[PDB]
Amino acid sequence: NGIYIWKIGNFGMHLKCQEEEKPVVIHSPGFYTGKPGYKLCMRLHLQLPTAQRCANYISLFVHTMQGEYDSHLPWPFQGTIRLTILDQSEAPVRQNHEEIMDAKPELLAFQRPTIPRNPKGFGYVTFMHLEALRQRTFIKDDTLLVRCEVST
C-alpha cells in the first residue's frame, strides 16, 4: 500500500480567510501510489459560512494525474482510498478522522488521465466539520496532516 502524508502548512491563515468569507481551495503535490503506480493528488476546500449545504465544512477530493507509468497500469484505477485527517494530540489512542472510499470501475474520475490533472475528482463534500478542529489537536505547529493511503 502506498501512503502519502500531505503536510498543509500555514493553516491558521487559511482558517482566517474562511472566517472572512474568502474562498479557500488547496491542491496537494502529485504523489505516486507506488513505483510503478498511479499518480494522484488531493483537493481540499474550506467551505464558506454562507454556503447552502456544507457550510463550514472541510471538503476533500482525490484526483488522478498523468504519470510515468500510466501506459503500464490497468485502467480505470480500481481499489480503495483511505483519506485521514490525523490527530496530533499526545494521547494514545489518538482519534483520527477517516473515511474509506471505494474506487468503482464505473466512474470517470479514475479513468486514464489525458490532461496533467484530471478535473474530475472523487471525494467528500462534507469530510469534516471545522468545529471539530477546535476540539482536538489536529493543528500542530500551525500545520494540518492529511493522510492518503491507497490500496489496489
Binding site: 477530493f61 475528482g121 463534500v125
Partner: peptide, 9 residues
C-alpha cells in the same frame, strides 16, 4: 456522509 464525483471548477 457518502463520497461523490466532483469536478473543478
Amino acid at each position: 456522509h457518502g463520497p461523490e464525483e466532483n469536478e473543478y471548477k
